[PDB]
Amino acid sequence: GVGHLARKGTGGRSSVSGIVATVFGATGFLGRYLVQQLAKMGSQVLVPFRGSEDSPRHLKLMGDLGQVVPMKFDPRDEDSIKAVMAKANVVINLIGREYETRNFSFEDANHHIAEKLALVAKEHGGIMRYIQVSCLGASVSSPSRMLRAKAAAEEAVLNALPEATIMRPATMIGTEDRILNPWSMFVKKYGFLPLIGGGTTKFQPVYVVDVAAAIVAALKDDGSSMGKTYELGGPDVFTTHELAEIMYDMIREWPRYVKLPFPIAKAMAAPRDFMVNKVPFPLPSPQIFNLDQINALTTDTLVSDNALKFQDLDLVPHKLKGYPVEFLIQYR
Amino acid sequence: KVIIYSPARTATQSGSGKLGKWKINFVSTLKWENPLMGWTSTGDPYANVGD
Amino acid sequence: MDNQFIFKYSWETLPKKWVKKMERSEHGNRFDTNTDYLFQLLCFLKLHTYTRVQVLIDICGVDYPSRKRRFEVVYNLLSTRYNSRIRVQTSADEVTRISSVVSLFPSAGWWEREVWDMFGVSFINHPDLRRILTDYGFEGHPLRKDFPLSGYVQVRYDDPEKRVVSEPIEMTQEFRYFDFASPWE
Amino acid sequence: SKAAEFVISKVDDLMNWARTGSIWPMTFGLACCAVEMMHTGAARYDLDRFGIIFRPSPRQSDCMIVAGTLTNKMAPALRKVYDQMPEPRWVISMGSCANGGGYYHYSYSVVRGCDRIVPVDIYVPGCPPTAEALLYGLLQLQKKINRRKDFLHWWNK
Amino acid sequence: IGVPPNSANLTEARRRVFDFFRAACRSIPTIMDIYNLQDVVAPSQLRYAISAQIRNNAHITDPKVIDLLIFKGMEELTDIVDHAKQRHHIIGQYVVGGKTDFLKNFYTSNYF
Amino acid sequence: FLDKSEVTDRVLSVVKNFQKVDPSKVTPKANFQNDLGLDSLDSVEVVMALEEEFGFEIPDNEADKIQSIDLAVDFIASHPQAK
Amino acid sequence: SNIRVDSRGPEVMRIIPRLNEDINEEWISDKTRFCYDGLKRQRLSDPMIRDSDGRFKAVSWRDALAVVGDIIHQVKPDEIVGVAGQLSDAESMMVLKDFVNRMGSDNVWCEGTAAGVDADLRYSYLMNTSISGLENADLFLLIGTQPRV
Amino acid sequence: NIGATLVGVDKFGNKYYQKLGDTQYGRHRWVEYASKDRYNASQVPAEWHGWLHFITDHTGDELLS
Amino acid sequence: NFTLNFGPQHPAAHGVLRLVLEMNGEVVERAEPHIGLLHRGTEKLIEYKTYLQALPYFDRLDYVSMMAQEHAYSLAVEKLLNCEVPLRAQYIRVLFCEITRILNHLLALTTHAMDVGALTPFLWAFEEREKLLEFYERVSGARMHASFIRPGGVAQDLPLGLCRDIDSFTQQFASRIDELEEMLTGNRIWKQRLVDIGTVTAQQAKDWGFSGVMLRGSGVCWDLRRAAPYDVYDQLDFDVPVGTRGDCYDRYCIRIEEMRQSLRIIVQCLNQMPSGMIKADDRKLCPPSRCRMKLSMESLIHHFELYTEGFSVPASSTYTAVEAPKGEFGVFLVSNGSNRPYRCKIRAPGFAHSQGLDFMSKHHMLADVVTIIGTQDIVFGEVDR
Numbered sequence A: 001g002v003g004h005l006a007r008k009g010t011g012g013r014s015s016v017s018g019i020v021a022t023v024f025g026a027t028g029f030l031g032r033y034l035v036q037q038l039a040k041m042g043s044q045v046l047v048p049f050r051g052s053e054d055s056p057r058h059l060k061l062m063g064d065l066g067q068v069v070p071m072k073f074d075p076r077d078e079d080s081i082k083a084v085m086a087k088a089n090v091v092i093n094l095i096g097r098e099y100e101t102r103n104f105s106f107e108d109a110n111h112h113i114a115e116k117l118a119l120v121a122k123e124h125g126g127i128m129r130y131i132q133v134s135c136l137g138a139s140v141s142s143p144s145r146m147l148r149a150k151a152a153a154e155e156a157v158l159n160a161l162p163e164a165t166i167m168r169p170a171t172m173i174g175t176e177d178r179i180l181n182p183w184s185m186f187v188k189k190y191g192f193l194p195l196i197g198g199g200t201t202k203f204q205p206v207y208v209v210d211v212a213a214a215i216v217a218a219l220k221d222d223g224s225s226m227g228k229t230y231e232l233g234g235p236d237v238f239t240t241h242e243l244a245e246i247m248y249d250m251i252r253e254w255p256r257y258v259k260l261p262f263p264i265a266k267a268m269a270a271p272r273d274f275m276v277n278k279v280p281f282p283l284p285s286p287q288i289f290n291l292d293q294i295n296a297l298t299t300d301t302l303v304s305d306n307a308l309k310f311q312d313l314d315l316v317p318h319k320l321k322g323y324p325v326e327f328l329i330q331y332r
Numbered sequence B: 001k002v003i004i005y006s007p008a009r010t011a012t013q014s015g016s017g018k019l020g021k022w023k024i025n026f027v028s029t030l031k032w033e034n035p036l037m038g039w040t041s042t043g044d045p046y047a048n049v050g051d
Numbered sequence C: 001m002d003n004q005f006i007f008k009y010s011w012e013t014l015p016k017k018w019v020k021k022m023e024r025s026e027h028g029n030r031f032d033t034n035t036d037y038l039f040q041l042l043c044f045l046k047l048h049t050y051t052r053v054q055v056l057i058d059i060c061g062v063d064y065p066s067r068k069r070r071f072e073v074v075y076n077l078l079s080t081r082y083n084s085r086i087r088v089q090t091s092a093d094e095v096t097r098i099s100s101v102v103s104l105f106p107s108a109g110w111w112e113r114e115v116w117d118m119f120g121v122s123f124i125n126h127p128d129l130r131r132i133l134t135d136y137g138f139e140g141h142p143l144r145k146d147f148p149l150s151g152y153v154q155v156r157y158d159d160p161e162k163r164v165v166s167e168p169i170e171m172t173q174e175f176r177y178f179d180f181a182s183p184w185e
Numbered sequence D: 001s002k003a004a005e006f007v008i009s010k011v012d013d014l015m016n017w018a019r020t021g022s023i024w025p026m027t028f029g030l031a032c033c034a035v036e037m038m039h040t041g042a043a044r045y046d047l048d049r050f051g052i053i054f055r056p057s058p059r060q061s062d063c064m065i066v067a068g069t070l071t072n073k074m075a076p077a078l079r080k081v082y083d084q085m086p087e088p089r090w091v092i093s094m095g096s097c098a099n100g101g102g103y104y105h106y107s108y109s110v111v112r113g114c115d116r117i118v119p120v121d122i123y124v125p126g127c128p129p130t131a132e133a134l135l136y137g138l139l140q141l142q143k144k145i146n147r148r149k150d151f152l153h154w155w156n157k
Numbered sequence E: 001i002g003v004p005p006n007s008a009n010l011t012e013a014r015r016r017v018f019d020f021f022r023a024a025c026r027s028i029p030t031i032m033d034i035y036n037l038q039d040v041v042a043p044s045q046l047r048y049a050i051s052a053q054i055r056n057n058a059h060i061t062d063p064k065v066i067d068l069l070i071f072k073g074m075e076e077l078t079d080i081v082d083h084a085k086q087r088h089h090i091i092g093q094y095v096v097g098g099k100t101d102f103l104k105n106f107y108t109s110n111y112f
Numbered sequence F: 001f002l003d004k005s006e007v008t009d010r011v012l013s014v015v016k017n018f019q020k021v022d023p024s025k026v027t028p029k030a031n032f033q034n035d036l037g038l039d040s041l042d043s044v045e046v047v048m049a050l051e052e053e054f055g056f057e058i059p060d061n062e063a064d065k066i067q068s069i070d071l072a073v074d075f076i077a078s079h080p081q082a083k
Numbered sequence G: 001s002n003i004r005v006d007s008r009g010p011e012v013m014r015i016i017p018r019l020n021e022d023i024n025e026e027w028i029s030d031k032t033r034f035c036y037d038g039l040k041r042q043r044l045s046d047p048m049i050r051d052s053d054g055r056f057k058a059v060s061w062r063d064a065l066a067v068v069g070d071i072i073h074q075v076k077p078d079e080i081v082g083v084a085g086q087l088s089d090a091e092s093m094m095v096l097k098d099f100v101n102r103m104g105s106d107n108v109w110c111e112g113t114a115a116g117v118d119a120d121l122r123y124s125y126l127m128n129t130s131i132s133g134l135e136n137a138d139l140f141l142l143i144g145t146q147p148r149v
Numbered sequence H: 001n002i003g004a005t006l007v008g009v010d011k012f013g014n015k016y017y018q019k020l021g022d023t024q025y026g027r028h029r030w031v032e033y034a035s036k037d038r039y040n041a042s043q044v045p046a047e048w049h050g051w052l053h054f055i056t057d058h059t060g061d062e063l064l065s
Numbered sequence I: 001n002f003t004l005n006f007g008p009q010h011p012a013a014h015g016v017l018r019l020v021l022e023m024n025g026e027v028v029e030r031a032e033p034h035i036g037l038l039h040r041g042t043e044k045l046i047e048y049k050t051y052l053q054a055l056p057y058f059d060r061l062d063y064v065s066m067m068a069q070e071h072a073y074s075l076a077v078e079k080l081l082n083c084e085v086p087l088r089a090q091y092i093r094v095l096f097c098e099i100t101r102i103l104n105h106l107l108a109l110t111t112h113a114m115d116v117g118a119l120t121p122f123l124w125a126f127e128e129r130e131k132l133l134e135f136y137e138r139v140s141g142a143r144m145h146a147s148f149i150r151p152g153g154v155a156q157d158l159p160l161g162l163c164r165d166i167d168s169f170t171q172q173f174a175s176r177i178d179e180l181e182e183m184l185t186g187n188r189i190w191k192q193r194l195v196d197i198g199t200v201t202a203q204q205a206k207d208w209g210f211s212g213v214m215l216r217g218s219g220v221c222w223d224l225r226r227a228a229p230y231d232v233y234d235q236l237d238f239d240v241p242v243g244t245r246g247d248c249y250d251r252y253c254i255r256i257e258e259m260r261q262s263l264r265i266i267v268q269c270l271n272q273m274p275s276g277m278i279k280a281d282d283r284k285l286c287p288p289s290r291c292r293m294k295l296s297m298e299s300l301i302h303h304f305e306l307y308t309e310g311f312s313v314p315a316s317s318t319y320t321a322v323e324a325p326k327g328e329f330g331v332f333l334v335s336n337g338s339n340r341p342y343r344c345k346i347r348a349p350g351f352a353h354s355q356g357l358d359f360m361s362k363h364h365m366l367a368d369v370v371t372i373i374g375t376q377d378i379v380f381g382e383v384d385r
């Protein structure tokens, strides 16, 4: 699958690489870093967005001039997706939602949209590299509804395109993550950090820039990445206890944990489950007490001992104790 | 690596006014084309210093 | 009062070992002195009754890469009492320290700092010789002839790094140098 | 959708009307375009008449007019000031110097466009732009604000 | 205070080098407080960094060049002492840090 | 005044952190620049480490006099500030 | 001939002569003057390897070098032939000769006058009279040569 | 638009008015836009642009011929 | 004492001002201005431009006084070229330099008064500022950056009604100055906020390189238009106001009187302006007429050479200074004989004035530092090139 890059510069902002990528869902957390690293090599990036035109505003700074071209679309409409995908030799999918909005359910936002994107790439022959980003714990048996939809999207995208790589990272840590920041907000608003599983579940947090660099390296491969499923995980296997202690180290606050068993947190997060319907479709999004996320913290999520990792791409993840978590000084 | 040389008289003019001066040629050839307007881009600070 | 009078008076009154080049013209009466006699010459020209030069207009450097003493430092002086202007010049390379005149003219501090910033010439006994115009942490002296016009580094905002960062320069359109020189000059 | 298509439309129109009728820019005067901004707000053109009043601090301003040459030493302060304004904020680039470096584009100490430091919504060309050119730029910014549909998009997600 | 007069021999240059190195060493605690470098770097890694810079500029035998180098280093130290430079700048400069080089360069680009 | 044991330990411990100093040669009497083959930069670095493990200061005229660890440890044992 | 290549960016605009009293003396031929057009046409720019059907596909430098290095080890040492072009420079010819010699072969030559010519004495393939020294000649005997072309 | 004279009508329907000044001027050359949907702030053709900005004394109907 | 920072980013006080004040109590003990935020490398960019191409750079140096810098650059080029300027061009240049002086003085006075807190005179003055920028917009095509004054003569001739309109302006500018003076001069608050603030002796002004109103407020009668006259300034009658106490109030009074005298000079220039051509007749240094370039071969050759290569200044160096509204504006031009300047230093009066802020403000209230800054009429376009 060689022919998707042709360096025409010094590898700087004004340099030219032969990559024209359409990054769906680039207005979120990972997209802000993926688009930045794509634009650094001189690759043109198309950023399709929905809703307000202020969402992709911060991405225009990343390219030189015309490198980043935001375009409106509608996932429901099929002609818009084809329009925003025509001039593209690479397609990267980042579309996903951890909570449920009545307009777009767990299956719609995580499986149907990815399936439609894979199809539209199939008829629009010419995308040399396709990347779909699922979650590390994605499995059909997973109790969490989001993970099951991501897994189903995985088989869907493999069936629709055998050449599509599946980057499958773990919980991300960064300036705008949804795990460390809600914890610190809860601490600064209520004084204590609840532990939904008692700080016992083990998982492998990964710094977001490492995931973006992994995707970039997979794009700039020797062809071995095509049709593979990487599992991107951090170096140290932390737990909800150790990460909270590290946060208190960064926030500089006296630790104060309130242990909560699984059933009580499950029942306290239940109200938002049967109150999805109401006079308004919008509803305050969950911050730490998502029922799906609590269910996701019932089975330990570790990178498989027999699956591809960072070291198979010639990358070394950052240690999530120094520079990766330095953003927490703003609450200090 | 630079080249020290004295530029010679052009073949299209018979005047000899721009002679006797010595220049340092930095051999700055790394240039490309801007893929938005066709302008000549560069990443070499010594692109035209010696000229 | 005039170029014809100041020239003769300074020819007679000044010690001979100080000045080594005297031009008398309509463009300006200049004095060229060694760098170790500059302070003495300006102190003499600031206190003498018939040459009361009490205003230092500015201090500028000129770059001559073809000379052994690369930099030329020019002291434009003004005498309000006698309505006359005097220019004094010295020459220094990149690694010699010339005497500062902030003791005589207090305003000389900022022009000396600007000369050090722009050309790299250091001044002895300057109360604080630090860059005044270039950006903090600037490397190189821009007003030298060998310094590229656009510099070596470029500044842009890095969203992941959440700060304004400095990167090697990379122009989207290079500076086009047009050679208009004529062979019949 | 029997009334959402109507009530949401009207509430969004109210939001846009308020935002267009009361714009409080933060003039970031840097060079000779500051003189043109002062002339615009003076008696002849009366920028106040449209509801625009300038503000000294970024805490209370929803717009930011960058008008002047942006140097390398000043860009961190520019970004810091930009990061301090509340969320519904816009940036207007005024003059050639703020747009793309202008007459100092090939300088060693000039940022070649304020759009490399902050996201720019409207570019006003000129050197310096006429005061009526700045009026046209503010009117274009107003026209862009009226295109926003904040409540409808919030409803649709 | 004032810029010292130009040196006359290598012994004076060495003495000024040692004085500047000691001044930089005394400046270490202040940087650890102005910038949050407490849980970042050991108090001796920076010391080794300045030592390494002095040692890799230690082939100079011209007293004037040594004096200019000392002056530039002192200017950099004074700038770092003040809040003029950004935090990552010093961390970007003051941190201590397979087939063939030619073949990797060949795979990279034609311009070595 | 201070006892010789603790000052001897404190001068015998920190000297092994130069990635070249032989632990077998360090002793109450072992000159820095002469007996260990050190550099003048290391000759001032040992003095700096003496004020890196404590807050006291050594004047510039008290650093280049004697580069001997015996006189150094005697001076350390005669440091009222330390303990 | 000593020329002066004028360029505007990454392309060559024109070629004009350059003074050299011993080689060209202010003149160049039409072929020299107007050869710059071909430098921007039909230019090979990517490593390419034939496919099973017989079509060239663009390939990275690493894989093409791997293919040629793998095939070079499967042939007998005397089966290797290296031929240099007419536009080759001395350094690349030297490297090619060294490479072919180390592989065990000795068949390296140039496009034209490489049929077995003895280059053992260096007067047998050179203008022993300098070009500028031809101005003192009284009689030219052109044996099987057409200098006009 | 009271005590004013209509100079001419534009192809877009814009009406141009003029009033006589004596020593200080004010409201003597303006346009009543034929639209009200935000009027786009720039709808004056080239023949009427000069007259509005006092560049030329020709109305714009005379500039056509 | 503690360390204080005034960076006003808003152009309610300059805009790029950065003061690091060391205050003991409410007093300030030292003022260290950090400059370089508007250093755009103008001096180095001049060396890469033709003498004609480098003219618009001087418009943007002191952007409140545009014609003053162009006049100095043109005079320097003429001095290095020995080019004679026709009398009508000289009268036009003097007229527009005095218009520029009036504009600068109005902006300085009322921006200083707005910093003190008097909001009304600002708009009253900017009305007259708009009226004069109309005159700039007529002769050239730009309201502010008018590349009108050029080394040979002047760029192009005057329109028909310019003299009549300028006369109509001068008929009422006296009353405008009178109203502005009535708002501020007699007011007791204005006196209390300027009297005895920023006192400088004549010796201090000479030592620190002060010029213009800063120097003349200390009693030094030094005007460059009378000491080293240029153009037709020696044929015009005008007085030189001189201060007595050196405080900020004398500076303000002298700034009023200078603007009245500029009105007087403008009237004289209008009355005595002769007829004739507006450029040097040496077409080797000035552009030909558009009708002559399209009809004569040599005129077309001159046009081509001027608008590609420009003129070549013989190898020399000189320093020429004019009386800019801020003070003494000097250009040190070095030529090596080519079509591009070898070196061009710009001596900005604001540099030497902002350098002296440390001693004028010492042992003064914090609220007096803004008045001390505003009385010097500092713009940072010239302070850091």
Ligand SMILES: NC(=O)C1=CN([C@@H]2O[C@H](COP(=O)(O)OP(=O)(O)OC[C@H]3O[C@@H](n4cnc5c(N)ncnc54)[C@H](OP(=O)(O)O)[C@@H]3O)[C@@H](O)[C@H]2O)C=CC1
Binding pocket: A024, A025, A026, A027, A028, A029, A030, A031, A049, A050, A051, A055, A075, A094, A095, A096, A097, A098, A104, A108, A109, A113, A133, A134, A135, A136, A169, A170, A171, A172, A178, D157
């Ligand atoms: N900790 C983490 O963040 C982890 C993330 N991942 C996966 O990585 C991917 C992105 O990471 P992150 O960016 O952090 O997640 P985000 O939720 O931040 O990315 C959300 C993106 O999805 C878009 N999107 C969501 N629903 C829809 C929809 N119905 N129609 C169109 N666009 C939609 C959003 O657009 P808008 O904002 O306009 O709705 C936004 O651009 C997701 O798939 C996530 O599951 C994997 C492991 C953990």
Ligand SMILES: CCCCCCCCCCCC(=O)SCCNC(=O)CCNC(=O)[C@H](O)C(C)(C)COP(=O)(O)O
Binding pocket: E013, E014, E017, E024, E027, E031, E050, E053, E054, E055, E057, E058, E059, E060, E061, E066, E069, E070, E072, E073, E074, E076, E077, E080, E094, F039, F040, F041
């Ligand atoms: C955070 C702190 C900011 C500032 C940090 C410092 C930044 C600048 C660092 C200084 C850069 C320089 O080159 S400044 C110092 C450069 N000067 C020299 O190198 C003198 C030549 N060296 C010698 O003479 C000897 O080798 C000697 C090494 C003396 C010992 O060896 P001996 O005695 O046996 O002879």
Ligand code: SF4
Binding pocket: D031, D032, D033, D067, D068, D069, D094, D095, D096, D097, D098, D102, D103, D126, D127, D128, D129, I060
């Ligand atoms: S665009 Fe022109 S007027 Fe505006 S700041 Fe830049 S140079 Fe000055």
